[PDB]
């Protein structure tokens with residue numbers, strides 16, 4: 001399928017044990033995709049003070065459409081030193097590895113894969 005229904009665990013930034021996916025734009029987008037497929041991807045909601053606590057490059061999920069079965073359509077956009085790789089809508093949050101942190105909520109998304 002070109003799109004996949006996912007429920008992402010929403011994590012508090014201070015709980016997150018692995019604060020990014022790797023060391024290059026290409027690696028973080030690769031790792032983010034693999035973790036989304038394997039069900040090992042969490043979401044951190046972006047507010048004042050959140051991003052400086054996480055590791056660059058960042059991977060955002062961004063709203064791609066203005067929501068089948070409650071799942072907001074999103075795509076991946078990476079960021080490194082203020083340059084973004086991709087073009088999309090509003091940030092739903094930043095993706096990180098999920099290694100067993102307890103979530104506060106779930107974000108239903110439909111991912112263009």
Ligand SMILES: CC(=O)Nc1cccc(NC(C)=O)n1
Nearest residue numbers: 004033034036037038111113
């Ligand atoms: C079934 C499933 O979850 N598939 C999935 C999810 C996220 C990513 C991908 N594959 C790619 C290439 O992004 N496949």
